[PDB]
Design a protein around this ligand. Structure first.
Ligand code: NA
Ligand code: NA
Ligand code: NA
Ligand code: NA
Lengths: 185, 185, 185, 185
């Protein structure tokens, strides 16, 4: 009976999106974004913690002047389930007024919290607000919200990796995998 | 006479560390850290915003269970320049007590800020605190502080890219470059 | 020649609003607010740090069920002076949606930051947003904004005390005084 | 039958410490503190939200130069029930190094949170750290901690008022009362 050190791959049912697929797509989106933001320096924002790996790869493949920033938010309880209103833990380091804001996200599902942030930025007089998401789960929507750039449309699979976690782990996987039912059931 | 949109490359005097060099070193360091933390899930933390690109790539090449978190800090004025004490704007999302902390940094120069945080984590009863930095400028130290893992030891260059900025721009370059004198003086 | 320890009163040229006046006005305002909010538990919010002494005394003389909360904000520089847009350092502990918000302030001058907060709460779907200020300098307005409750309308005086500071000192005076010119110039 | 508008007093079993007692004590503590901090300008800190009414009254009865500041913290869960380690939501606006810190609190019960903050300030190189608390429940201690100034020693009563809440309400009472079992049972 061979026993060895636990590896994350042992918890993965299958690879939904490979690292190779991801890099191919990041290269595509970054080129499109560079073209679309040619003239101005936008503020590319990521909401911690999920967006980090994608935002990092995407922006280095986006050949244009831009500024990066980040926000941290937390839930107010069941009221973060109605309008998506969240508690701001860390706001942007610079003002939104007159800026072209690009929100970089790992996945859009219910669309609630991203919807709340987009309109908060429009309230703060952003010149524009657009969203680029690596993954999109359209059947999950609880409010209408269409991302401006989408890497992949995914079905209702329990996904982890490339920013996506299960109990704060797995975010470091270089691919998006489907977690075996055993691990979370 | 022909004009057109500006490109970041025009502002770079030379490439100090190529994207290929960074990737080779990230692979190397990822493997070493995975080996060192194979029997425990450490808390890998990055201090916004410079550490992101490196933290993303490094953790992707570190095949072990681990948790990610982030801190945001700001200067208290000259009392930060003289001692490292910084104002915490976003604290860790989880407790430090009993955890193995791994601080991921882009560059260590004076070492003041990092030293303040290291001893803050020790005050909070961390089990261990280690530091991995992509770049190390040992001649700049104002306090004794040696990184546990170092990608590159750099000389006296004005650098930008791969997280390093000049007036908040250039962090998205996929390499570490030397900025032309004209741009900052 | 006799010297001794310094006393704050030495720095005050004249009492503008005495402790006796403030207390009489707080009693009056607290009774009005209690009547206006008798059938609802409003969320009374103070923006740190100036509003504290007034908010403590006001709410104590307001005999009705209510909840207290506080926000902390900082300036974005020359982008907070022409919009009022400020950086949120500490957001409310509870959601704004559907709540009657009562902002307690020490003084309204330009009305910029307060106007930004009011419309922020309306963006957050507050049921109502009202403002009670101990002092009002209407001649300083940079935006149209009238408080719903005002203790005293003040002229063009350099004031300190009862929350108002000069270099973070004097906030503990139990009255509002005019600072001797010597101290600030 | 006779039904009237709900008043907070209807939820109060009895008044444990009256407004009259509170003011008499604040006057005493304020005079002692002004004497103890005669020569220096201490940084008087309050942890939101409970400390507000007391800090407000106490500091205005403290006739000495001082700076006020505030912190906001949140629990990490069960790990905040061992060392008292908490998540910092709002840190001090100024540095602690070399400052005489005076923590103003409404009540010390387990002593966990305050013990963590006191030693955090000593870690940040405060010149001194002392505590003034309105109420003290010494039998509640889970860690050793004696306040330097204490208004009243209270037994194990479910208290509300003068900053103390029950479901975020009652903080505005101008006295400290014992809540009727009915209300919380
Ligand atoms: Na651009
Ligand atoms: Na591990
Ligand atoms: Na009410
Ligand atoms: Na003093």
């Amino acid at each position: 009976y061979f026993q060895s050190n636990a590896m994350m791959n042992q918890d993965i049912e299958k690879v939904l999106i490979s690292e190779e697929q991801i890099q191919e797509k990041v290269l595509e989106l970054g080129a499109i974004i560079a073209e679309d933001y040619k003239n101005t320096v936008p503020l590319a924002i990521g909401v911690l913690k999920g967006a980090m790996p994608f935002m990092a790869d995407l922006l280095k493949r986006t050949d244009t002047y831009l500024e990066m920033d980040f926000m941290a938010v937390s839930s107010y309880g069941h009221s973060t389930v109605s309008t998506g209103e969240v508690k701001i833990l860390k706001d942007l380091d610079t003002s939104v007024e007159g800026r072209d804001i690009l929100i970089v996200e790992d996945i859009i599902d219910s669309g609630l919290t991203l919807s709340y942030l987009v309109d908060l930025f429009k309230y703060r007089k952003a010149k524009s607000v657009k969203i680029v998401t690596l993954l999109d789960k359209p059947t999950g929507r609880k409010v209408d919200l269409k991302a401006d750039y989408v890497g992949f449309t995914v079905p209702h699979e329990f996904v982890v990796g490339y920013g996506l976690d299960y109990k704060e782990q797995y975010r470091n996987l270089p691919y998006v995998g489907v977690l075996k039912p055993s691990v979370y059931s």
